């Protein structure tokens with residue numbers, strides 16, 4: 001019905017032309033609080049960003065936060081069963097740059113993921129997750145400092161599309177019949193009481209993702225792009241991802257064979273560095289990141305694999321309490337921590353706000369406000385090195401001081 | 417045509433009745449050499465097993481090895497394009513207990529996996545992979561000793577079924593048309609130039625796997641069974657796996673709520689221990705194994721997830737050079753390392769034979785030859801503690817002696 005969103009009177013809208021953002025001194029930034037621990041981490045992110053912006057520009061610049069709604073809080077604002085109001089999608093696109101806390105997705109039934117809904121409806125086809133080591137962060141591995149990677153996760157297709165039917169349903173039986181009788185499929189071991197999902201992977205979806213990964217490698221003078229896939233078992237989806245990725249590198253970036261292949265080199269047109277384009281089968285890759293972390297840099301992979309890789313890598317540098325991300329499309333960008341709503345901690349002021357804070361760091365950098373972004377990095381490193389940290393770091397360390405979520409936010413500010 | 421397999425004159429066939437193996441003193445055991453590094457690890461496994469058997473039983477018992485064929489070597493024995501002769505399947509079933517080196521599966525085209533073909537054709541629906549720490553093994557993690565888990569990976573369905581069509585093929589277009597027009601599917605982002613795979617998960621496939629996992633937990637007095645799944649995003653496949661797994665625990669093993677759930681406890685009828693039945697979402701699980709390894713024990717998961725988990729966990733305890741496995745069905749069992757053919761090392765006598773050797777350890781234990789199995793464990797621990805090890809361990813250690821694959825086999829024997 002009537003919108004409950006309040007456009008800030010003091011703010012102005014970020015604009016986009018020529019693919020370049022025009023960010024005013026007083027930009028309006030929509031944010032979603034998030035379900036569960038969103039109630040803890042979001043207020044910490046708001047105060048930390050505001051402090052970094054104030055310290056960097058001395059009042060010349062200020063973000064006008066505009067709360068928008070999705071998830072539990074939306075049902076309370078807009079009414080029962082309003083989980084994702086249309087205006088939320090419209091406002092994120094209109095305002096160009098936004099940030100969200102995590103959203104709860106029920107298992108085995110219930111609503112489809114609102115996080116996926118946002119990514120899909122806004123065509124935010126890049127899930128960008130940098131994973132790097134902050135000095136002083138406790139880690140289960142001996143050399144966390146060797147992990148410095150950037151995940152480019154395809155964000156619009158794969159088994160994530162949400163195409164599936166429940167076992168014993170008329171639809172599942174309908175699909176199973178089609179597959180067996182019309183497609184001559186014989187490899188369904190138990191066609192009765194059988195759930196069915198569909199996994200699509202397209203040339204266009206692949207290439208736009210890999211193109212972004214390669215451009216990022218060029219823009220940031222990175223060393224390599226590794227295509228991760230399970231293309232021996234899934235030849236026509238994951239295997240195609242690998243083939244299209246290599247093809248894209250050759251056709252658009254001049255990739256050439258390294259010593260007869262199969263890897264390619266792409267010459268960085270800005271620095272002259274030869275960027276290696278390579279690939280690793282996904283299961284083997286989960287060992288490679290632990291046993292040979294220094295050999296990997298930019299990672300390009302499909303939706304599901306990227307999901308797994310995000311948590312696995314984050315764990316090497318302290319866990320998903322320190323794992324930022326962004327969902328990026330051609331028209332807008334929605335910043336977002338890797339982690340979920342961790343309901344068991346929700347409202348305890350306990351979890352690590354580092355992830356959403358570092359997602360705001362990416363947002364600020366995205367906005368060209370690099371000085372403010374630098375202060376967040378500085379404050380984060382300062383607080384961790386001072387061993388004043390949240391429970392997830394404290395349990396992996398001797399002699400640390402346990403801080404609440406809110407207190408760790410203050411610690412970051414104190415270290416700016 | 418004419419079989420090229422030679423049945424050993426001195427051996428006798430293992431038999432099965434009442435689900436119990438009757439293993440003669442002179443059992444015939446089929447083995448497949450394997451492609452690639454199979455040429456290195458298989459001869460080491462043969463000599464190590466023979467030594468353990470000789471030392472344990474002083475000539476009273478002896479394995480009559482019978483080479484059978486699949487993969488590259490089969491094409492050379494039986495002719496071009498004979499990759500998996502029917503007799504190989506027949507002989508594994510007939511002889512009840514067999515062991516294989518790894519087999520090469522091409523990426524993005526070429527033959528479908530022979531490893532999967534064997535598992536599927538023989539209905540070896542359990543992929544059983546124990547992951548534990550051998551003292552003295554180098555590791556990227558600080559506390560590898562906290563990892564002591566057993567993977568039960570569903571081995572007959574999931575996206576592994578091999579049901580998929582190539583982008584732009586008549587069949588893919590046919591399936592895409594069916595999905596869009598007859599099933600009203602709207603979530604395929606790019607329906608053109610689009611590969612398509614099918615992911616089936618059934619009640620029966622799930623329950624037989626989880627039943628085995630729970631029985632193993634009972635038989636070995638383990639602490640918990642964790643169901644790993646991505647059931648928030650794949651509600652009707654992975655989410656169903658989780659639901660059926662819990663249901664099975666309740667209906668067949670008397671599982672009861674722990675403090676109002678969602679976890680269950682299953683009382684061990686032999687020891688009285690309460691076995692915890694729980695679940696973790698798959699991405700989060702890849703952090704859990706690193707940050708809270710001691711909280712996990714028996715793992716039950718679907719085909720693909722188990723594939724990933726096998727390598728990720730193995731890496732915590734030295735990598736897939738020390739990662740054994742078994743494919744187990746109701747009628748026979750085929751032992752097999754977790755690792756592949758690593759073609760870049762093939763024939764260099766370089767890789768770690770530990771994995772296939774420890775798979776033979778499982779085979780021996782499976783045969784009730786526990787004394788021989790114990791000697792393999794002892795020799796393995798002895799060689800590693802002596803820091804005489806293959807390249808994969810040597811690079812993670814200071815002051816080790818680098819051994820060839822064959823030499824490490826001798827080192828194991830020397831330490832029996």
Ligand SMILES: NC(=O)c1ccc[n+]([C@@H]2O[C@H](COP(=O)([O-])OP(=O)(O)OC[C@H]3O[C@@H](n4cnc5c(N)ncnc54)[C@H](OP(=O)(O)O)[C@@H]3O)[C@@H](O)[C@H]2O)c1
Nearest residue numbers: 102103104105115321339340341342351352392648697700
């Ligand atoms: N993009 C998103 O909004 C998003 C992402 C992932 C999951 N989810 C949703 O969240 C719900 C719960 O999923 P889940 O429990 O598997 O994942 P989760 O909410 O990320 O929690 C998994 C574990 O990760 C650790 N963790 C998560 N956030 C943390 C933080 N801020 N600081 C420190 N540690 C943190 C905790 O580990 P320990 O308890 O071991 O210390 C937590 O129990 C699901 O409905 C899922 O759909 C949403």
Ligand SMILES: NC(=O)c1ccc[n+]([C@@H]2O[C@H](COP(=O)([O-])OP(=O)(O)OC[C@H]3O[C@@H](n4cnc5c(N)ncnc54)[C@H](OP(=O)(O)O)[C@@H]3O)[C@@H](O)[C@H]2O)c1
Nearest residue numbers: 232281284518519520521531737755756757758767768808
């Ligand atoms: N069940 C099977 O038969 C099986 C299983 C997996 C893969 N494969 C097949 O094998 C082929 C190659 O796949 P891939 O290269 O991704 O996997 P891979 O053959 O397992 O090799 C991956 C990496 O794992 C390490 N590794 C593997 N075996 C080892 C050993 N015995 N000792 C020490 N380290 C070892 C090596 O790591 P580093 O080089 O980093 O030291 C190797 O490069 C594919 O065709 C695949 O289909 C078969």
Ligand SMILES: [Ca+2]
Nearest residue numbers: 307310338699
């Ligand atoms: Ca995730």
Ligand SMILES: [Ca+2]
Nearest residue numbers: 283723726754
């Ligand atoms: Ca594997």
